[PDB]
Design a protein around this ligand. Structure first.
Ligand SMILES: [Mg+2]
Ligand SMILES: [Mg+2]
Ligand SMILES: [Mg+2]
Ligand SMILES: [Mg+2]
Ligand SMILES: [Mg+2]
Ligand SMILES: [Mg+2]
Ligand SMILES: [Mg+2]
Ligand SMILES: [Mg+2]
Ligand SMILES: [Mg+2]
Ligand SMILES: [Mg+2]
Ligand SMILES: [Mg+2]
Ligand SMILES: [Mg+2]
Ligand SMILES: [Mg+2]
Ligand SMILES: [Mg+2]
Ligand SMILES: [Mg+2]
Ligand SMILES: [Mg+2]
Ligand SMILES: [Mg+2]
Lengths: 33, 292, 172, 159, 208
RNA sequence: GGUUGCGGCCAUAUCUAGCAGAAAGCACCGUUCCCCGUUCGAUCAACCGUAGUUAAGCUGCUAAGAGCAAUACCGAGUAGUGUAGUGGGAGACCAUACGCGAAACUAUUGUGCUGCAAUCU
RNA sequence: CCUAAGGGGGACUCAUGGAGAACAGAAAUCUCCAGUAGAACAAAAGGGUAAAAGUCCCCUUGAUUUUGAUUUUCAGUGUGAA
RNA sequence: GAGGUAAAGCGAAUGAUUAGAAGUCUUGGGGUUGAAAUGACCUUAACUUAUUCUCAAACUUUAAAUAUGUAAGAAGUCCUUG
């Protein structure tokens, strides 16, 4: 079968963590406790 | 939670593009490359073959650019084709060829290069460029301007290209975008190109559809049915038209049922007019009063 | 004029996008692509990770997910086949402010295809892009523009259209 | 350490105008330059080929050569105790016709027109420009304009 | 530690603020610029009194802090902490440099302190209060003047509080419904923009 | 006067929210044999102009609209500045003399003009 | 430092935010909307760039040959660079 | 013609920066409701909106004065045609 791939549109050449991915910004997933 | 984006500072510092770029109509990169002339050919203009396709029309114009705006040399439209014997499919690839041939012949008539630079009088689909005649004026050189329209092998703009080239204009081009170009074996199958020039693809669709889906054939090819035009006599419609196009390529404007003044007076009735300063001031005062 | 009951204002599906974000590359992603090609009948396309996350076990440019876009009658058929698994009951918080909706099945054999132990079961993601006639304005090359406010698709219109066309329930 | 590179100190000179970045309007490429034309030099920062040196930014000179995309301009630069003739190759994006030509070339036409008419009328006309002269005598009417007396105002603080 | 202030009195250098180019700068001694009842409404304190500079000069952050403390202490002691709103109108943004803390070789100094560069007629401190509290507030500023170098004038403002309107134009705009509260400050009516929003925000606007 | 194609200047043309649009044009719109391009005839290619629609695009109008533009017994001859003195002042700085002269602010007005060709109730 | 990160052509639009979609959560992938560049362009900083100069794709070697003119530093010498 | 210094600006971009006010927390905690429902409330802190005080040699929409380039003809202009 053919294997096309999704092309790159972004320009972020750096291979690092992305913007707005901080800990403690999330709510309490166990707030129901 | 988030900042409102369309602030007054966003609008203040916004640089609007060129008017005809914001309309999405002019590619100014390509326009700069097309229009700009060698500075040592001082006032000699470059001539563009503007080819534009609408949903119903083919527009072909020969244009030179000036500071006050572009100037049309000649222009041929597809709705002129019924005068020459082509009434339906005014946006075929073959209609594109006919429009290109018409604009080429009309321009050469305007210049006086008719007897010299006749063109390809026997269209066989071979790739050919209008060669200059020794000891005579060079052929009218024109460059193709396809605008924003994509370059594909088989596109209709190159139909106008081939028609104009065969009409006697010198238009630099290569045959690798014509229908019938084998990209693997880099040669042009001139038989398929000649098929496309004389409506062969449309005639083959008529023949192939008639014996398979007659109901769709009745709706798609209605005009041919009430005109009693079958596939086998499709080609002549173009083949005669070419000859007719070469017989009298002069522009005949449509006789106008009304004068310019009558058109203007009629149209001015359906045009809203801006409120006077006093009118909107009175509106504001009334809106204030009704607020108590 | 400006009639809301105009023929050209009719809502209808633009495209249905099927997403399987298997977190890895190799045999599992290839079999997910096989599942998608089976369901849609079209060769799917593999998406690469935009960046590296150690927590998720992915790295930049590693082929992670596979997705496919279907339009026309086949999109409608796949959509109702997936709504059967959802027993025709979406939530009010499944429709976006732009008038699109989506749901997610958890096993791809509930859709109605043959199960293979080698393939296993993959979950699947369904998203439907709604739109009226004239969206070509925003997608064509020449004279590309935006769609007027009245012609836009929103959450309420899509919810009502979904309830009418499928006799389903949107759980508010 | 001193730095004296080619484009040193051109941070603001070679900047585009505010809200005027991007593509060049094509009247720049439609102008026609002939040998002997007087042209102003103003570097366009967005075209880096054929760019003038920062010395010639703001200078005016004579076209001496016309090429495919460029003109040669003659500039006289002071080097010590004399002028040196400089020959700068500039793409036409960095060049504009000097507006001082079109005003003087019009005064030449006007002088020719005035002179020929005076010969037709058998009279004389003076074509030399004159500086502004002191104004003549005049009478100021005070009907509706009786003089208003002003006085210096007292000191006040306005904060 | 600190040199006498005479070493840094005059605006001899260009402004030298904190930036990406000098980073190891200490903090200013003054951190609080609003004192007293800073939440009072505009109508509560009609009288404004300024301490105005008659000097083109530099004032250290230490002097700003000392004068602020002196004025605040005196006025709260005599009239109460809620009888006024004192505002310091100059922020020390200019970094002073010290060299010793060889010879003249490599003599570029290190950050040493912060100073505000004030002009002639520039307001240093503003105090909005009631009219009956004039003589106290003046005496609060007259003491603070001792903490500053150079000449300063105590000027009673023509305007209502910290507003840009005279004490008569403010009353005219107030009885005409063109002024609304905004906490400690006010918003004035505009004859530009959305008419409906303007009318809604100022209901008592007697239009003419 | 409307509209289209190609433009010049490049917001007085942009942006937001509403409303209207005769004729033609433009547009959306229909189809997949063919040239062609896609995960997807959505974009791109081709075919029909046939089945439909002014809903959108487009155009115009509305808004004490945002922005932009222009003007000024607006601010202000203010800030700044060239030149001068055996002027003032401990100094910091300031005044005066002969000249040049802002920006913000305030108020008012406006909201594309136009070239070539073709076409139209 | 780079056979592309040079050259030509084509297609696309970036940072980011909002609203949505099984596992999936602040960060995986998909969709729409907004988005004058708040991204990227080997490396300092500045300038420049949006149907591109950025991202992706196709073809390539003009990073070739001959020897003159010119700009900068300047003595109007050399070298470097253009 | 060119300029980006003085001045000016910051309810204009970038960077720095004082104070309240009104909203949203749904993607902050403490307390009090809740027998448990994350579904309210009091609070501070966050952001958002319209404001507010003060700034920049390596900030800027604007933008001087002084200084600076060119022109003010006979080697020019016009007419005809080699
Ligand atoms: Mg192109
Ligand atoms: Mg500049
Ligand atoms: Mg280069
Ligand atoms: Mg001592
Ligand atoms: Mg010093
Ligand atoms: Mg030594
Ligand atoms: Mg390359
Ligand atoms: Mg490159
Ligand atoms: Mg390209
Ligand atoms: Mg040299
Ligand atoms: Mg050299
Ligand atoms: Mg060197
Ligand atoms: Mg500056
Ligand atoms: Mg400088
Ligand atoms: Mg300054
Ligand atoms: Mg300013
Ligand atoms: Mg600021």
């Amino acid at each position: 079968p053919s294997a096309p791939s999704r092309e790159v549109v972004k320009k972020n050449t750096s291979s690092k963590k992305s913007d707005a991915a901080p800990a403690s910004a999330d709510p309490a997933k166990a707030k129901k406790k | 939670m988030q900042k409102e984006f369309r602030t007054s500072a966003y609008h203040s510092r916004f640089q609007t593009p060129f008017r005809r770029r914001q309309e999405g109509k002019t590619d100014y990169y390509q326009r700069k490359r097309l229009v700009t002339q060698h500075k040592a050919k001082y006032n000699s203009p470059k001539y563009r073959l503007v080819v534009r396709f609408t949903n119903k029309d083919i527009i072909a114009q020969i244009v030179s650019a000036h500071i006050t705006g572009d100037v049309v040399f000649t222009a041929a439209y597809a709705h002129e084709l019924p005068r020459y014997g082509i009434k339906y499919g005014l946006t075929n690839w073959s209609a594109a060829y006919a429009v290109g041939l018409l604009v080429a012949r009309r321009a050469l008539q305007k210049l006086g290069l008719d007897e010299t630079y006749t063109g390809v009088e026997e269209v066989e689909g071979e790739f050919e460029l209008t060669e200059a005649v020794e000891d005579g004026p060079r052929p009218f050189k024109v460059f193709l301007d396809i605008g924003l329209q994509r370059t594909t092998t088989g596109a209709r703009v190159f139909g106008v290209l081939k028609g104009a080239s065969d009409g006697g204009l010198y238009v630099p081009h290569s045959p690798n975008r014509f229908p019938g170009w084998d990209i693997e074996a880099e040669e042009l199958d001139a038989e398929l190109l000649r098929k496309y020039i004389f409506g062969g693809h449309v005639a083959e669709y008529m023949e192939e559809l008639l014996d398979d889906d007659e109901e769709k054939y009745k709706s798609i090819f209605k005009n041919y049915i009430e005109e009693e035009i079958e596939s086998e006599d499709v080609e002549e419609i173009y083949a005669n038209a070419h000859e007719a196009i070469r017989a009298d390529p002069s522009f005949k404007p449509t006789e106008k049922k009304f004068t310019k003044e009558q058109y203007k007076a009629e149209s001015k009735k359906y045009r809203q007019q801006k409120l006077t300063r006093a009118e909107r001031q009175a509106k504001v005062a009334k809106k204030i009063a009704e607020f108590k | 004029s400006d009639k809301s009951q105009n023929v050209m204002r009719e809502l209808r599906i633009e495209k249905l996008v099927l997403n399987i974000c298997v977190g890895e590359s190799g045999d599992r992603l290839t079999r997910a692509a096989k599942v998608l090609e089976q369901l849609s009948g079209q060769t799917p396309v593999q998406s690469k990770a935009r960046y590296t996350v150690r927590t998720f076990g992915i790295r930049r440019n590693e082929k992670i997910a596979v997705h496919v876009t279907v339009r026309g009658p086949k999109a409608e058929e796949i959509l109702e086949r997936g709504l059967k698994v959802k027993e025709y009951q979406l939530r009010s918080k499944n429709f976006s402010a732009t008038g699109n909706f989506g749901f997610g099945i958890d096993e791809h054999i509930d859709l109605g295809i043959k199960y293979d132990p080698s393939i296993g079961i993959y979950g699947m993601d369904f998203y439907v892009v709604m739109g009226r006639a004239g969206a070509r304005v925003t997608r064509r090359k020449r004279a590309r523009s935006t769609i007027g406010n009245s012609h836009k698709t929103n959450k309420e219109d899509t919810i009502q259209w979904f309830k009418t066309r499928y006799d389903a329930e949107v759980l508010d | 350490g001193k730095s004296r590179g080619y484009r040193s100190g051109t941070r603001y000179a070679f900047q585009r105008d505010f809200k005027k970045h991007g593509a060049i309007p094509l009247s720049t490429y439609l102008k026609v330059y002939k040998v002997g034309d007087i042209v102003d030099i103003k570097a366009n920062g967005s075209i880096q080929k054929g760019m003038p040196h920062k010395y010639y930014h703001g200078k005016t000179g004579i076209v001496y050569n016309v090429t495919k995309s460029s003109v040669g301009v003659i500039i006289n630069k002071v080097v010590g105790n004399r002028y040196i003739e400089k020959r700068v190759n500039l793409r036409v994006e960095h060049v504009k016709h000097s507006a001082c030509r079109q005003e003087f070339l019009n005064r030449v036409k006007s002088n020719a027109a005035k002179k020929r008419e005076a010969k037709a009328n058998g009279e004389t006309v003076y074509l030399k420009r004159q500086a502004a002269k002191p104004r003549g005598s005049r009478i100021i009417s005070t009907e509706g304009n009786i003089p208003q007396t002003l006085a210096p105002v007292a000191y006040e603080t306005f904060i | 530690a600190r040199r006498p202030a005479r070493c840094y009195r005059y605006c001899k250098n260009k402004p030298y603020p904190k930036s990406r180019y000098n980073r190891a700068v200490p903090d200013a001694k003054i951190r609080i610029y609003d004192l007293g009842r800073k939440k009072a409404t505009v109508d509560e304190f009609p009288l404004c009194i300024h301490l105005v500079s008659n000097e083109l000069e530099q004032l250290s952050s230490e002097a700003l802090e000392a004068a602020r403390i002196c004025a605040n202490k005196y006025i709260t002691k005599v009239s109460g902490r809620d009888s006024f709103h004192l505002r310091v109108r100059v922020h020390p943004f200019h970094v002073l440099r010290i060299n010793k803390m060889q010879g003249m070789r490599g003599a570029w100094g290190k950050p040493h302190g912060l100073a505000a560069r004030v002009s002639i007629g520039q307001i240093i401190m503003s105090a909005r209060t009631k009219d009956s509290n004039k003589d106290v507030v003046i005496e609060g500023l007259r003491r603070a003047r001792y903490k500053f170098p150079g000449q300063q004038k105590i000027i009673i403002s023509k305007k209502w509080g910290f507003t840009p309107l005279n004490r008569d134009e403010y009353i005219a705009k107030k009885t005409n419904g063109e002024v609304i509260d905004d906490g400690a400050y006010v918003k004035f009516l505009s004859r530009k923009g959305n008419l409906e929003a303007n009318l809604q925000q100022f209901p008592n606007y007697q239009y003419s």
